[PDB]
Amino acid sequence: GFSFELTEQQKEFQATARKFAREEIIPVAAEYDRTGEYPVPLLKRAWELGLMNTHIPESFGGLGLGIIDSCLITEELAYGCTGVQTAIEANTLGQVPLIIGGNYQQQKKYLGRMTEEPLMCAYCVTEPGAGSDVAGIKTKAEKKGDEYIINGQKMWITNGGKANWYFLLARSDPDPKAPASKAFTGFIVEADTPGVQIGRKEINMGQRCSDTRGIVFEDVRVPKENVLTGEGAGFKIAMGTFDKTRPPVAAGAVGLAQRALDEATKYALERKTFGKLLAEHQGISFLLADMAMKVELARLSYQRAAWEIDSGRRNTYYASIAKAYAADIANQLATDAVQVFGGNGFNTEYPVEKLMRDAKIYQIYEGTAQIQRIIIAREHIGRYK
Amino acid sequence: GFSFELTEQQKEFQATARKFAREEIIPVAAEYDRTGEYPVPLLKRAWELGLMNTHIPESFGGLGLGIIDSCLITEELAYGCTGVQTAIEANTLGQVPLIIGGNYQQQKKYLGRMTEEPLMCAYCVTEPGAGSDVAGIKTKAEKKGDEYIINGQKMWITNGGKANWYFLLARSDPDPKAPASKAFTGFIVEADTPGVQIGRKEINMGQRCSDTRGIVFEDVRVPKENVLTGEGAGFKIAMGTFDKTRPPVAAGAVGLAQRALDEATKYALERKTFGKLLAEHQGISFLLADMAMKVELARLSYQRAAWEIDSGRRNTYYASIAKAYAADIANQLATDAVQVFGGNGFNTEYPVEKLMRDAKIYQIYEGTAQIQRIIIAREHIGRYK
Amino acid sequence: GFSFELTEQQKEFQATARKFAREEIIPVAAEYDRTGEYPVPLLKRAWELGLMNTHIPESFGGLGLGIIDSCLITEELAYGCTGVQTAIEANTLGQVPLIIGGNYQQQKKYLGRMTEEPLMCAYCVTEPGAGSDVAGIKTKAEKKGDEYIINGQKMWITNGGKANWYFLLARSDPDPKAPASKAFTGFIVEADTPGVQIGRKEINMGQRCSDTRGIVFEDVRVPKENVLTGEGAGFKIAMGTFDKTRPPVAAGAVGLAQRALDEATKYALERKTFGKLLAEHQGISFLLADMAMKVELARLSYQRAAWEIDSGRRNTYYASIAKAYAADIANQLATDAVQVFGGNGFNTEYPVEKLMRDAKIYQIYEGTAQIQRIIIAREHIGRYK
Amino acid sequence: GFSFELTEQQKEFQATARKFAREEIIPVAAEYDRTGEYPVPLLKRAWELGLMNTHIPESFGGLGLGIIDSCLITEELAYGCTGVQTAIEANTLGQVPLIIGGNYQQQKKYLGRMTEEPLMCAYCVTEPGAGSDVAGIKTKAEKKGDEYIINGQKMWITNGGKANWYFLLARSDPDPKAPASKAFTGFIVEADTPGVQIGRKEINMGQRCSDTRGIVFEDVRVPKENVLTGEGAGFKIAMGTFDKTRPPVAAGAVGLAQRALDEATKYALERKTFGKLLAEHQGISFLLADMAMKVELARLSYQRAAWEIDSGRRNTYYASIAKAYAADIANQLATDAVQVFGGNGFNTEYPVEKLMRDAKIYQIYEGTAQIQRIIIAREHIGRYK
Numbered sequence A, B, C, D: 001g002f003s004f005e006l007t008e009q010q011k012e013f014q015a016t017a018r019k020f021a022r023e024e025i026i027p028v029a030a031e032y033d034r035t036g037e038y039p040v041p042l043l044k045r046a047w048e049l050g051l052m053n054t055h056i057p058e059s060f061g062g063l064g065l066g067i068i069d070s071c072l073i074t075e076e077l078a079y080g081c082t083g084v085q086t087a088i089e090a091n092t093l094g095q096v097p098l099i100i101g102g103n104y105q106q107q108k109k110y111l112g113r114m115t116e117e118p119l120m121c122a123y124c125v126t127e128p129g130a131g132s133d134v135a136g137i138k139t140k141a142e143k144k145g146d147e148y149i150i151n152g153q154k155m156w157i158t159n160g161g162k163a164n165w166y167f168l169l170a171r172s173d174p175d176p177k178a179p180a181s182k183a184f185t186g187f188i189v190e191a192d193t194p195g196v197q198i199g200r201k202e203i204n205m206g207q208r209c210s211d212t213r214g215i216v217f218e219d220v221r222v223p224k225e226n227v228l229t230g231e232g233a234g235f236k237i238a239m240g241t242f243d244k245t246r247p248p249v250a251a252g253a254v255g256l257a258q259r260a261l262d263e264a265t266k267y268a269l270e271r272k273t274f275g276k277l278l279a280e281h282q283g284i285s286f287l288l289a290d291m292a293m294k295v296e297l298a299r300l301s302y303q304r305a306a307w308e309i310d311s312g313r314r315n316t317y318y319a320s321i322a323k324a325y326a327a328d329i330a331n332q333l334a335t336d337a338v339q340v341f342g343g344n345g346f347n348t349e350y351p352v353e354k355l356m357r358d359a360k361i362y363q364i365y366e367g368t369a370q371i372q373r374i375i376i377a378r379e380h381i382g383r384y385k
């Protein structure tokens, strides 16, 4: 039977995440956007609150939460700032591969350490020449005795220069004609390994306090015991990762949509034009209505997709719907939020212009808007074919 | 926690409704749209199958199903023909008022009959001069000893010429400055009462097999025992009704969207142009994807709204979101479906132009797209104010 | 220098077209939609008014008007009814090929006769298996001595069963590998020729009084002197035809958008809800505003495209923009027009539901919405390549 | 008849503006957005080139160009940077009032100086408490013998800290029940007048090189000879100004749309994914097509609006359509352009995220998207009423 009711435990995680988001993140999110520092103090706290690495199984000192849980928490954090929240989320991204494709030993060693200190990790797939086309990746891995030799370059890595270790997808089969399903290998690469050249901090339009860099791998030596399931099983792990990790990215976008909604509404209830409150102009109340409608829909789609995977079923279809839809409305609301503010909305002393800048990324990373329509269409047709 | 899982009981109604809709409705739907006959044989069948009057409590020989159940069923019926489904739902519409504001004697008598014979009923609010503005209604109810004299005209009444009895909203407080909450009285009126003048069958663009007529009420005598809760409680019963009754109309709209999607998909997997299957042109695959996205989103919204009211809480906000969103996407899908059929889609021998004609009403009846925004805004704003 | 000013001659054509459209077409357009007769009386009058075949050069007794002229006149006619107007427009469609690819003799004989009586003609390209893909046409033409032998079937021919003669595109080169630019031939085929089997009147959603039928060609013998420019020049003539003929189809759609706009506005200025005129609700006035905006834009795009060809330049790009855009807004306005009418809009006694049904075709024939985006994109890229 | 043909004179300004914009603006635009410096060297150049103060009559050493001319130029400038272009247009904004409501002495003095030196001016209407509602302004103008005492605050003034003189709209009628048409007076005020307190430079999301500040006016003394037409004629000069001045803002928006389109196209013809050029994915070709459609449509609308006013007729209706439509599509194109750049589009080293930040203002200044609908509606409705 249907249920849209949170558990008391969930209600508590949510309250914690909300309180920290609004009491700690909000008051400083603006300064961090301006300066573009790494929000170390915030991450630290988030760690102590147990609002990071939430998905690490209990066996490794983790909380062992589900995808539903992460979404719930990450909707709250995103509300404060998606710059900060992205830092946090990236940790889970680099961890999932391990959780779903790692052995006890690999898990214990790399997931275990995240539990002990406030360490960070990153997910390295994208390259200058390939992002959407993962099968177009050119980073190569060559087996030499008991180790692998990694040569290649990765681009746009969140937590790029702050990561303890990286999950790294490389092409292990040189045969150009080798199929995607057996041409790649997933590795755990320690950032301190000789040969990893961390690039400069890339300066983007939004999520400015987030660390995004390119990375070069020059003859990096990785022990075979850092291969995750085996040689060739790299593609499947990547794909399997997006299904658990898309819902939470959808939840971030409807956090940033909720913020926009809250700001717009509050303002409309204060500002007057032509003798009436903004909210009293039918054209504005209609915009607020439309805005509200979208947030609820998008919150509803990520819950569906998260529940699906938590139930132990493939959620590719629902996850893409969620990421596709959540990304679009966060973008729509962001722009509609500065509109409501008028001249003030375009101004940097107000909180909505930041939102409009942060929102854009949701339509690009973790599978572009267009890539999502490719997945959905393929998954959709599959039921008539 | 969350659950998007049907009960084994709900799975069975669902199967029943589906089989009925695809084996019995679909094959004749087209020929009822053309002739505009009342689908008598279909309604009888739906009654026997127990896919009608689903909300009548057990005490009066009903199934005493919830709103989640009604929705589930409706979505299956609507897939077949919303012309036929609208006939069915009109029944639930006239019944609800009776269920939420009637006494045992009233329910026993009027609800009890619905459970004995395949009888129909109708909801009479709308007038020539007022639809959206139900505070604008002018049909008067004047107290004359132990009865009320009713004078007025109702317009666009579903089942108007086929109902055994009517729920009738009338103005009982003559004072123009009287508030809505106290100026109207709800009555249950038997169609055979002298003075009720049923008009001709109205020819509309869609849902042509549905019976919708105008009704004149001159000097209609109604016993005081037919007053629903009390004089003045009219307004509240009406609004109370829309909350229970908005979700199922939404579900009807995402059934007519599912159908559109199924037809378009099947066609896209057969027709060829420029050497490729329609589904192979990225232009079309993207269109199909957006279509699936909206169906899933709309389904989720009515589910939420239904669960809410079943849980014992007022769902005005969620109900209006679902009604408004489902309504819009039904209309978008209908036209896009006609579009991937090309030239054949404009033709009467293919099933999608009916869908297009049918869909338009969803943005009008049971609270107009604009009226839905008014409600959402009001409900939304009240959480900040 | 810029000028959006009509010539006095143009002002006069317009006045004539407007007066006839509103005094003769409107009062009977509804009855013709219902019955689906051919509006013979109207066509007759239109002929006498000199509102038909407007593009026939003066040399053949024609008025020799330009594309700007046709658009202007046809915007006025379409306002009355696109069912009727389509009949008229089809004449020009079948004539253009002749005007641009025929010799003095062919022109004199077939264009000349249109000037003498109120005859009709049709354009035959589309087949059951191919519409959008003209190069996919299978009607074959085989040269036998001094004549050609035509075998094949055409579908969806406007004026199909009322045409004196037809322009007919057939594949004259059996080599499957033969290029589009030399594989087809354009013919003038007299309807009375033994072997042409006119099909039944197809029943569609809109433009119901228009004659649309499929046609079979069984060993039809056509004199070589009915070939238009020569064997192989068939494709180019077809393509060349759409460029002169798209603007006027765009003008029809913004005629049907203007009607919708006029009806919606008038109604909004009469109907009251919640004490105010519809026009006084900001949400409605905003809809009317948006509606007005679209019509002006679309009228502006067809004028650009018509002027382009009249200046003796290739207008493929502007023509597609116009047809694409005009088709979409007519559709948007049609639905927004019934919305404004409320319950009445869905009703067949009101004039907007017809409009919503008529409008859909604009997105399909004379190059689908999708096909237009293909042309535009190709023409657009061409300027950077 | 119709003409979409530029004069040989207009072709030359156009070339001049284009060359300036691509050879001088583009190369430094990026570095002015980052530093937010006033583009002094660029403005000087524009002045020498004669691409500034274009509307000043010949009598005062001007070019005495029309609105069509201004638009043509502006579109070219805006293509480069609307940050820089906005500085330029602000000049024309403060000048117009003077041109339509000033005497010879006023024009000679204040317009004459603009033609001698590369001086700037500003338009001062907007206040902290009122922007959209210019009848809501509170800066008072009190008559004191032969001068007026001005008290109030202006907000968001373009060129506010760089202008030689200001056009200043003030309330001269203290009576609250006084009509807009008689309650305001227009003044020309010299920036060096004791009492004018220019605020700090405001940091906005876009058009960062543009100077926009708040200004306090306490006990500012203005000679009666600086009153534009007469006491009370303020309102009408202001509205009169927007009509001449809306078209060019529209043109600025379709320059920033043209740029977005050019960048996206160029990129789509270089980047490869899944073995094909971005432009080769139908998904993208369709997006590109829609983009081109809107640019062409918006260009046409400002042309129409400009021609109208140049023809000597009130263009309120057309001006607002152009402002509203151009504004919207500039915003749609900016985000779609960022989209086909993928990850690089979010990065500061690529030219499209600036476009996105820049574009948002177009939906706010010079009459808000909502205010434009109000005007269109009013203008539209008045043709039936």
Ligand SMILES: CCCCCCCC(=O)SCCNC(=O)CCNC(=O)[C@H](O)C(C)(C)COP(=O)(O)OP(=O)(O)OC[C@H]1O[C@@H](n2cnc3c(N)ncnc32)[C@H](O)[C@@H]1OP(=O)(O)O
Pocket (backbone or CB within 6 Å): A085, A086, A087, A089, A090, A093, A123, A125, A126, A131, A132, A133, A134, A135, A158, A179, A180, A181, A235, A236, A239, A240, A242, A248, A249, A252, A316, A365, A366, A367, A368, A371, A374, A375
């Ligand atoms: C907020 C969080 C903070 C961090 C933010 C930053 C995070 C990021 O941006 S990471 C982003 C990385 N970039 C991407 O997301 C791009 C992803 N793009 C894709 O998903 C793919 O390229 C996609 C789905 C289009 C597939 O392309 P394609 O080349 O055709 O492979 P395809 O042929 O479909 O499949 C190959 C094999 O994989 C399998 N496969 C495909 N999809 C899936 C799936 N979803 N699940 C499982 N297996 C799959 C197939 O079954 C196939 O197997 P086999 O050989 O046995 O038949």
Ligand SMILES: CCCCCCCC(=O)SCCNC(=O)CCNC(=O)[C@H](O)C(C)(C)COP(=O)(O)OP(=O)(O)OC[C@H]1O[C@@H](n2cnc3c(N)ncnc32)[C@H](O)[C@@H]1OP(=O)(O)O
Pocket (backbone or CB within 6 Å): B085, B086, B087, B089, B090, B093, B123, B125, B126, B131, B132, B133, B134, B135, B158, B179, B180, B181, B235, B236, B239, B240, B242, B243, B248, B249, B252, B316, B364, B365, B366, B367, B368, B371, B374, B375
């Ligand atoms: C598929 C099925 C087949 C049949 C299909 C055909 C069925 C139909 O088409 S019937 C069409 C339905 N028509 C409509 O829904 C019209 C929409 N109209 C409305 O909902 C309302 O009039 C609406 C929302 C616009 C409000 O206008 P208004 O007249 O000003 O009432 P308002 O002043 O807001 O409220 C008056 C009182 O009602 C109360 N009220 C309002 N909404 C509610 C509610 N949801 N629950 C309880 N009370 C409510 C208010 O609290 C207020 O009370 P109080 O005095 O105690 O404070």
Ligand SMILES: CCCCCCCC(=O)SCCNC(=O)CCNC(=O)[C@H](O)C(C)(C)COP(=O)(O)OP(=O)(O)OC[C@H]1O[C@@H](n2cnc3c(N)ncnc32)[C@H](O)[C@@H]1OP(=O)(O)O
Pocket (backbone or CB within 6 Å): C085, C086, C087, C089, C090, C093, C123, C125, C126, C131, C132, C133, C134, C135, C158, C179, C180, C181, C235, C236, C239, C240, C242, C248, C249, C252, C316, C365, C366, C367, C368, C371, C374, C375
């Ligand atoms: C209101 C009026 C009443 C009547 C209403 C009813 C009227 C109708 O519906 S008639 C509708 C007929 N159906 C259509 O409109 C479908 C039209 N579809 C098309 O336009 C095309 O198929 C189209 C443009 C996609 C081209 O496809 P394609 O197969 O790739 O041909 P393509 O390779 O582009 O070109 C082949 C040759 O034609 C030329 N060509 C292509 N487009 C054009 C053009 N616009 N102008 C001139 N030449 C052209 C090419 O240059 C090429 O030449 P070459 O061999 O010398 O290099």
Ligand SMILES: CCCCCCCC(=O)SCCNC(=O)CCNC(=O)[C@H](O)C(C)(C)COP(=O)(O)OP(=O)(O)OC[C@H]1O[C@@H](n2cnc3c(N)ncnc32)[C@H](O)[C@@H]1OP(=O)(O)O
Pocket (backbone or CB within 6 Å): D085, D086, D087, D089, D090, D093, D123, D125, D126, D131, D132, D133, D134, D135, D158, D179, D180, D181, D235, D236, D239, D240, D242, D243, D248, D249, D252, D316, D364, D365, D366, D367, D368, D371, D374, D375
């Ligand atoms: C790119 C350039 C760089 C610089 C960029 C920065 C520039 C800027 O941002 S300045 C921003 C501009 N701000 C605006 O445009 C705000 C929009 N506000 C308005 O236009 C109006 O206030 C508007 C349309 C809402 C009307 O509200 P309202 O106060 O009620 O006036 P209203 O009552 O309608 O009319 C009052 C009188 O004015 C007259 N009026 C209205 N419009 C006009 C007009 N276009 N022409 C002449 N008279 C007019 C009416 O006729 C009426 O007169 P009367 O008494 O004789 O009958």
Ligand SMILES: Cc1cc2nc3c(=O)[nH]c(=O)nc-3n(C[C@H](O)[C@H](O)[C@H](O)COP(=O)(O)OP(=O)(O)OC[C@H]3O[C@@H](n4cnc5c(N)ncnc54)[C@H](O)[C@@H]3O)c2cc1C
Pocket (backbone or CB within 6 Å): A090, A122, A123, A124, A125, A126, A129, A130, A131, A132, A133, A155, A156, A157, A158, A204, A212, A361, A364, A365, A366, A367, A368, A369, A370, A371, D271, D272, D273, D274, D278, D281, D283, D284, D339, D340, D341, D342, D343, D344, D346
């Ligand atoms: C701030 C930021 C953080 C990021 N974090 C990470 C990270 O931690 N780890 C990581 O691995 N990556 C990360 N990414 C990269 C991100 O995953 C990619 O940018 C995204 O997948 C898009 O790929 P791309 O940039 O190569 O664009 P491209 O793939 O080149 O695409 C360009 C455009 O073409 C479209 N397109 C491409 N292929 C097709 C097709 N077949 N059909 C239709 N349209 C198509 C795309 O939609 C896009 O609009 C990050 C990027 C950014 C900007």
Ligand SMILES: Cc1cc2nc3c(=O)[nH]c(=O)nc-3n(C[C@H](O)[C@H](O)[C@H](O)COP(=O)(O)OP(=O)(O)OC[C@H]3O[C@@H](n4cnc5c(N)ncnc54)[C@H](O)[C@@H]3O)c2cc1C
Pocket (backbone or CB within 6 Å): B090, B122, B123, B124, B125, B126, B129, B130, B131, B132, B133, B155, B156, B157, B158, B204, B212, B361, B364, B365, B366, B367, B368, B369, B370, B371, C271, C272, C273, C274, C278, C281, C283, C284, C339, C340, C341, C342, C343, C344, C346
């Ligand atoms: C086939 C059919 C079946 C029906 N079945 C029933 C039934 O069984 N029982 C019954 O009682 N009624 C029924 N109705 C009537 C239906 O509920 C109304 O038509 C619908 O509520 C719209 O009201 P209206 O027709 O009066 O339009 P109006 O209320 O006159 O409104 C006209 C337009 O103005 C807009 N509008 C109105 N007020 C506002 C406002 N304040 N702000 C902004 N926009 C506004 C509306 O969106 C609409 O577009 C039926 C109608 C149809 C066509």
Ligand SMILES: Cc1cc2nc3c(=O)[nH]c(=O)nc-3n(C[C@H](O)[C@H](O)[C@H](O)COP(=O)(O)OP(=O)(O)OC[C@H]3O[C@@H](n4cnc5c(N)ncnc54)[C@H](O)[C@@H]3O)c2cc1C
Pocket (backbone or CB within 6 Å): B271, B272, B273, B274, B278, B281, B283, B284, B339, B340, B341, B342, B343, B344, B346, C090, C122, C123, C124, C125, C126, C129, C130, C131, C132, C133, C155, C156, C157, C158, C204, C212, C361, C364, C365, C366, C367, C368, C369, C370, C371
């Ligand atoms: C009332 C009516 C009157 C008509 N009058 C005439 C007439 O007088 N003369 C005449 O010759 N024809 C006429 N036509 C036919 C009309 O030209 C075609 O119906 C139209 O071109 C569409 O082709 P189709 O029906 O084959 O659809 P298809 O070409 O089969 O297309 C089906 C769907 O797929 C899409 N599609 C097809 N190819 C592609 C592609 N490569 N990329 C992306 N999407 C694609 C189309 O957009 C459409 O949505 C008429 C049609 C109608 C309905």
Ligand SMILES: Cc1cc2nc3c(=O)[nH]c(=O)nc-3n(C[C@H](O)[C@H](O)[C@H](O)COP(=O)(O)OP(=O)(O)OC[C@H]3O[C@@H](n4cnc5c(N)ncnc54)[C@H](O)[C@@H]3O)c2cc1C
Pocket (backbone or CB within 6 Å): A271, A272, A273, A274, A278, A281, A283, A284, A339, A340, A341, A342, A343, A344, A346, D090, D122, D123, D124, D125, D126, D129, D130, D131, D132, D133, D155, D156, D157, D158, D204, D212, D361, D364, D365, D366, D367, D368, D369, D370, D371
């Ligand atoms: C960079 C910049 C430069 C500027 N340059 C100048 C300049 O040179 N000179 C000058 O005088 N001003 C200038 N402006 C100010 C600009 O004109 C106003 O900000 C714009 O008119 C919006 O007014 P507002 O900010 O007061 O928003 P408000 O008027 O407060 O409105 C807030 C929101 O409510 C909506 N709204 C308001 N009234 C209604 C209504 N009746 N119905 C429906 N919706 C409504 C608006 O759409 C908006 O979304 C500038 C502003 C900026 C940001």
